[PDB]
Amino acid sequence: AKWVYKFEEGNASMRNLLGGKGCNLAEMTILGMPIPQGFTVTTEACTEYYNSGKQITQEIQDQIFEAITWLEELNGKKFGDTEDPLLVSVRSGARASMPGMMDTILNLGLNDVAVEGFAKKTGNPRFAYDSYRRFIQMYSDVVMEVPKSHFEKIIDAMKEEKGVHFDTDLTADDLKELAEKFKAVYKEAMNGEEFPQEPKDQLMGAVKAVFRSWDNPRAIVYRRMNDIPGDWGTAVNVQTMVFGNKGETSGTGVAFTRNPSTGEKGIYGEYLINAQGEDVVAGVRTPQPITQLENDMPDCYKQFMDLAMKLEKHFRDMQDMEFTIEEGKLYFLQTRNGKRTAPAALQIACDLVDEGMITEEEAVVRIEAKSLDQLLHPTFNPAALKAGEVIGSALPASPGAAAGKVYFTADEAKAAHEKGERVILVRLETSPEDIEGMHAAEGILTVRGGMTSHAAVVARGMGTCCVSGCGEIKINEEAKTFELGGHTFAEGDYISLDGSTGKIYKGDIETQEASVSGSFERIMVWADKFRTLKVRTNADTPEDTLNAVKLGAEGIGLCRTEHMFFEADRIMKIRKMILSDSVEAREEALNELIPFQKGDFKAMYKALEGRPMTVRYLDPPLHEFVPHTEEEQAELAKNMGLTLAEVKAKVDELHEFNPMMGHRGCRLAVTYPEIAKMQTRAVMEAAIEVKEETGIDIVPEIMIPLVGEKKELKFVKDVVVEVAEQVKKEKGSDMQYHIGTMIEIPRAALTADAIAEEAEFFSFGTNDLTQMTFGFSRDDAGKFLDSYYKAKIYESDPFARLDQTGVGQLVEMAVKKGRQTRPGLKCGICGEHGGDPSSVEFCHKVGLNYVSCSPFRVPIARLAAAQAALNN
Amino acid sequence: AKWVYKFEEGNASMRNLLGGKGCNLAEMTILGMPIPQGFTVTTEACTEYYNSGKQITQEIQDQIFEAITWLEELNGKKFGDTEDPLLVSVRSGARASMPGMMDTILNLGLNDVAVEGFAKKTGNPRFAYDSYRRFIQMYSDVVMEVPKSHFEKIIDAMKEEKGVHFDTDLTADDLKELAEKFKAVYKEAMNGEEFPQEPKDQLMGAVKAVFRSWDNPRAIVYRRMNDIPGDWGTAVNVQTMVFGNKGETSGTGVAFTRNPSTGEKGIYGEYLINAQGEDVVAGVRTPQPITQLENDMPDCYKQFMDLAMKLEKHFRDMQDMEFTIEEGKLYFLQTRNGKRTAPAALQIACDLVDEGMITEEEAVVRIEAKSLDQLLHPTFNPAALKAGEVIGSALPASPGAAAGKVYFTADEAKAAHEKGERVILVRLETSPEDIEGMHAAEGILTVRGGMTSHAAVVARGMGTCCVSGCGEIKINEEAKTFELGGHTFAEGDYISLDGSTGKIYKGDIETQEASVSGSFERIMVWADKFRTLKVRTNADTPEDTLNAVKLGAEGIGLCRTEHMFFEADRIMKIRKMILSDSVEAREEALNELIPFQKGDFKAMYKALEGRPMTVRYLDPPLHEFVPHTEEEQAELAKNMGLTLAEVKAKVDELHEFNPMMGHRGCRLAVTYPEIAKMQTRAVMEAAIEVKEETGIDIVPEIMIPLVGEKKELKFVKDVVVEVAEQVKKEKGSDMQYHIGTMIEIPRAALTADAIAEEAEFFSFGTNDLTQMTFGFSRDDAGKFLDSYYKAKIYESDPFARLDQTGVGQLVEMAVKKGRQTRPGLKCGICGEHGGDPSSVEFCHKVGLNYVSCSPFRVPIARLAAAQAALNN
Numbered sequence A, B: 001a002k003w004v005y006k007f008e009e010g011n012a013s014m015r016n017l018l019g020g021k022g023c024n025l026a027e028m029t030i031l032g033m034p035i036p037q038g039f040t041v042t043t044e045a046c047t048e049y050y051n052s053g054k055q056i057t058q059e060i061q062d063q064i065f066e067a068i069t070w071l072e073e074l075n076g077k078k079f080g081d082t083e084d085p086l087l088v089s090v091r092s093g094a095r096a097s098m099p100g101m102m103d104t105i106l107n108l109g110l111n112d113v114a115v116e117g118f119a120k121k122t123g124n125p126r127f128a129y130d131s132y133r134r135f136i137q138m139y140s141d142v143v144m145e146v147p148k149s150h151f152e153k154i155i156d157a158m159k160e161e162k163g164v165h166f167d168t169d170l171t172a173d174d175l176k177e178l179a180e181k182f183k184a185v186y187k188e189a190m191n192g193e194e195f196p197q198e199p200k201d202q203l204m205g206a207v208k209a210v211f212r213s214w215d216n217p218r219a220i221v222y223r224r225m226n227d228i229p230g231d232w233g234t235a236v237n238v239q240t241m242v243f244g245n246k247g248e249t250s251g252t253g254v255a256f257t258r259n260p261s262t263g264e265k266g267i268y269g270e271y272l273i274n275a276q277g278e279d280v281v282a283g284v285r286t287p288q289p290i291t292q293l294e295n296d297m298p299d300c301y302k303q304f305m306d307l308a309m310k311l312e313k314h315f316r317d318m319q320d321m322e323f324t325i326e327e328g329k330l331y332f333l334q335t336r337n338g339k340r341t342a343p344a345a346l347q348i349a350c351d352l353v354d355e356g357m358i359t360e361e362e363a364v365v366r367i368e369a370k371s372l373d374q375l376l377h378p379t380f381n382p383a384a385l386k387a388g389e390v391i392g393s394a395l396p397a398s399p400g401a402a403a404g405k406v407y408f409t410a411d412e413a414k415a416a417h418e419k420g421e422r423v424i425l426v427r428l429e430t431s432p433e434d435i436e437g438m439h440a441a442e443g444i445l446t447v448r449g450g451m452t453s454h455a456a457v458v459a460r461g462m463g464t465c466c467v468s469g470c471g472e473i474k475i476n477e478e479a480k481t482f483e484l485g486g487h488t489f490a491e492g493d494y495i496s497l498d499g500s501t502g503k504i505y506k507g508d509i510e511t512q513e514a515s516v517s518g519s520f521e522r523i524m525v526w527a528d529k530f531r532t533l534k535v536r537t538n539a540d541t542p543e544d545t546l547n548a549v550k551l552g553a554e555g556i557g558l559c560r561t562e563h564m565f566f567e568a569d570r571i572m573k574i575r576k577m578i579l580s581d582s583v584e585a586r587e588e589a590l591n592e593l594i595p596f597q598k599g600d601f602k603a604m605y606k607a608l609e610g611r612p613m614t615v616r617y618l619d620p621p622l623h624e625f626v627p628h629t630e631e632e633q634a635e636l637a638k639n640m641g642l643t644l645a646e647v648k649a650k651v652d653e654l655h656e657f658n659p660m661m662g663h664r665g666c667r668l669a670v671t672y673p674e675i676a677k678m679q680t681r682a683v684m685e686a687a688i689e690v691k692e693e694t695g696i697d698i699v700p701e702i703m704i705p706l707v708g709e710k711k712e713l714k715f716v717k718d719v720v721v722e723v724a725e726q727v728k729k730e731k732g733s734d735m736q737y738h739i740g741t742m743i744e745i746p747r748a749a750l751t752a753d754a755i756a757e758e759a760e761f762f763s764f765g766t767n768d769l770t771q772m773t774f775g776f777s778r779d780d781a782g783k784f785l786d787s788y789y790k791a792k793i794y795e796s797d798p799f800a801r802l803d804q805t806g807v808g809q810l811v812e813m814a815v816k817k818g819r820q821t822r823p824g825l826k827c828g829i830c831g832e833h834g835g836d837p838s839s840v841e842f843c844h845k846v847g848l849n850y851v852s853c854s855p856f857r858v859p860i861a862r863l864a865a866a867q868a869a870l871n872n
Ligand SMILES: O=C(O)C(=O)CP(=O)(O)O
Pocket: A558, A560, A744, A764, A765, A766, A767, A768, A769, A830, A831, A832
């Protein structure tokens, strides 16, 4: 029992039960705002709908109808009544906001007779039939899936016959006619079934459609891109209708109390006089900037601006609002903390702080850590842009430099992107169904629609460039081409877009590295202030190190050493070592590498200036270094005075069934200690030296990969220590160094307390750990991961987001057991997860000392790290 | 009386009397630091030296010698005594720090006999003669002006004979010999006079040389580039010597408690074992990074690091220090708040704030507003730099992208720059004498010398790129060429330098617009927080407006309108107007301009979004718009069906003796009201429109230039109001607008109360005001301004720095009288002065409402504005 709540019965706290929209309608109601009345069917009733074989239980329906009685009475109007009908809107909303992915049905309750009593009661038939044909369309769209196309097609016919230019120029007779044409569609696509004439059937149809939709392939895919758990469900909000299409003193709009693309304080958005939401979003009649409404209706604007600032001070954050003016009276229909780009969240959280509205803690905790990846998106190269051939212009909906090949359907764009092409989605407008392809594109270019069109809002969300409403464009879906300014563009052709200026360019404009907004540096100073995790970087070179330190990296959590062996002037040393038959010949071969590698390391220690650096010993099997090309093998043979066949028999001998789990890492160091001794001499000779040259202290961190047994790490640790002590004696050095291990083999975590007896520190290599915990290679996982996503078996990609429940158990355990034998054991993480907020939060919570990610992701972890401290 | 103070007798407060160095030695002494003892001859004794015909008065000498007795006793050694001599250093220092411009003489007191007693008393003759030959050189340099060259030449001979590689490898016999060769120089350049053998003559000679030097052409020029008043004088510090050349456990160094180029926290600098200051600065023996000393002498380093952090916490700012270790004992010789680049001052003031050391007020007030011009210096274009042909590398002393033509003497570089060439000064090392040319160069490239060499420190000061110590270079002063890496560079050849990486490039590398450091945005938020002046920008286009708003411009204080008449598609309209003979023909001609100008203004109001914008009416005389080329006149005649002679007679008729003070501005609007009516119709039609399109309110600000009489402004104001009211009626607009005036004719300030009866706001055009107050055109002022600088008649350029005493009187008065007739009179400033800190402080103090400067200077005024509030 208790599946439905009146707006008055809830608040912003009951969000999990009401959903964002529901809890926000309740909250605004509580504040006494001109919020039309209604009720919310809870997220729990959604789960219940799912636990009852995808059917509305008897009790929920009783309660829906029961609340509808409550509305009828409040209003003095019978729901869908043939005489003076009560009409309602039905709007779906889950705990997490999903702008552009949810559903809205306006004017529900209308039928062949309720519309006449409606036209009679309002004395405005054009208005009654306008609403009824709007409901027929939205209901067919939302409840079934008749493509808006079939309706727009019908309305376009009628306007392009009655010799009309806008929807606004249609007769009540035309609308009356259109409504019959629209109903013919829903029927002419429903096994002959006719449009539901009963208001209750309409309401239950809309309700089950919302729940049903929660499991649409598009909602699934979307929730994973946004880390929304599927079991959250969605609530359904039912509200008494207010109409912005009753006439000239009526309208509807969508506003942001601050710019969601820049963060700049002030009202932002659009509206339309005489219209319903759909129209604004669709932009057929070009939306007016919200500021112009003060021109049209100063009075409602004054009231709206006050209510908007009251909503921002109250939620203590920028608000995304929706309102409708009905014959001169203002109503608010929604408000939610507005989605925004990274630049925007920083700028805003900083103004909110400076005005006394929120604390620095509230500001840091508020920002979506993941979005900071946007801050480093390459921006355009001024010279290049300047010489760029502007071919058109429009609304800069979402910021960013996009340059890519054009496609005309999300699927074609998503696919092209898979094949490694930068893409540009060009559409009349986008819809929920285009989501994945929108996620695959560099940028989005739309023909119609403004700042609050689907593409605009979904892109601000993704942090993806979008120029929308470029009415100059003429799309040719049939031929996959479009005409703008100077030419006709065919699929594949490059074009660039500047979502900051709204400018469109012919060709592929050059871009360079983004800089960094103050307020970025400010949030970072606030982030560093509360975070306890240190943040290190995965950097293999001097240049990546600087950029990384330049972003707050406090050192290096993973310096791979493979390139020091793979590079052109190196490869032959290891090949010669591989093809030798003597431990002495293996040594001489290896030793030739010392000058080159000691050089790489010096250069890293120079760039580091005392910061630490965890150096990873050789990770791949030997087979990776030998030539695979019969020709390349030929030449290896010629260089080492061997027969091609002899080389071939060596390459064949090094071959493995599963390279991922073969003779490599520590196991390779065990059979061939020479390799580690050599890497150790290169590391220590470089440190000592750079240290005698700068006076800046260094404490090398040597890390052994692919370890699963204490004694296994000890065999290698002993080799390295002997060489490090030797190099120290040759150079009269007191330098300290620490030899630790990677924890990336499940056994290593399970026996970490034993491993900790030898390892002076642990680094969690979570790509491997996850591969071995889950039992699969990332590279082969593609042929099924997707079926897993589609089927809901996984809601997150394990390679990108740390699997807390499983792999997370091994990381917690490793740290705990490791510290039982070595209390001050320092623990870091350097697999891909180290830069993922939730992953960085789990690490903070289980005690890691630091996380480590690629240069450009450092700000994300710094911010993630601070939130983890604050939130825990 | 009281011309000399012991270190113990003063403190950091007595700076004006002691000078920076003097007051700092006193302060460190007060803190009980290992500061060798001494006394300071005050800045007042310098003035006294000047008021006595440039002679040391009898009383000052008595007091100098008197203090020297105090030292002798403290030390138990007689000043210059033949047996156990007391030796002292003499160091000049004024109230304002002038790094690289002051004087230092070490080992003063040595003579032919005191050096033997010195060698005897220390049992180290090599050490005694080393010091004596150092004193001979420095004294000849400093007191006379024998070029270091004549000595380095002599020492190079001797080393390149005794087959030696360093100064350190010279025998006491060699030094004994060298000292005689050095003395021969001072004599062989002094009318046969021999080197002063009397310690007292040496001390008085050094003292008078310091005062004398305060009036050196190079000190003058330097003080103006740095706004140091000449009457401040300089003090002379006399200190008991500590020697870092006594041996292997002796040394000398210069450190910064934080990086003065980046601001990065931590010790920065260099030193040399067995040497005296000179050596470090000169970098013959490449200076060691200060961090390496912990390797050589951990004990003195530990003590030095503690003392350094005690000096920073105490002065509560980054410290520039100088120390000497004498046979294992550490002494500090100087400390001063360190000079630094803009990036560095921000970063630092921000860390100091975050550590609790200084308040945000103390941080803002501390930064040198003028230096922010550095923050917008174009930086290199990554692609360009990447493809750049690195030809050499060295120490990145001072940050910045420099690209220019190379020169080998400051004078050649300064001159070349006058002719508009970007320049690159390449020198073995720089000296005080190269200052102006260093000020003319894009960058500085030196052969020897490190982070604390002359070029390095003076450039950090100027905010100019410098790569120093590139020992690979081979300069050919004689042929004006240098060999580096791949080639031989000849005068004029382009080369670029990256003072951030120390890299040197062949050719002219492309640069783009700088970005902006957080901590910049942070100081700005702190600056805006305390500043009361608003800051507007001098911007004539959409693009300059954005950049300007992008930097904190709160609108526009001057939108010139000339280009709207000069541009290619405009010029003929005004030419036709000029050549018409009818007020009706003048109108029709003018009116053709309205669509083009209304267009420029719309675009400005679009970019402005409600910010204000003071629009300046047509400023130049008519003669400026007519063709001056007989050919161009020919074509004007052909276009207007006139004879070339007729056009010529019009151009001749519009000619003026002095265009600066002719028929223009308001006077032109009086005779030809048409012009202002037209500009008014373009302004108001654009505002109303952009306002009907955005709903964003606009309140046009129309400003009349070159006004000196109430009734004169009223004649024009009446014309504009009639047209503005008319345009408002044609468009049904309630738009408000304000008509004000420029105050740039002295009469206008003198009668400002009358002017204020008509003008709704005043803008101070200080280029004009200053021209008319001083009675000269800036363009012709060059043939004497310099003689004025050189002669001290002016210490500041009046066109760049507001003349407070004179022109400032007219600005104060204008505001005061203006507000007697119109209390809320809004006052701004838009001449060049609006972006000069001191100029912006005077404005704040006399009540302006806002200052207005070019886009890129806005941060300077924002910061200047905040300091003005805080400091007043
Ligand atoms: O995650 C791991 O197991 C790592 O070794 C780090 P990498 O895979 O990026 O080298």
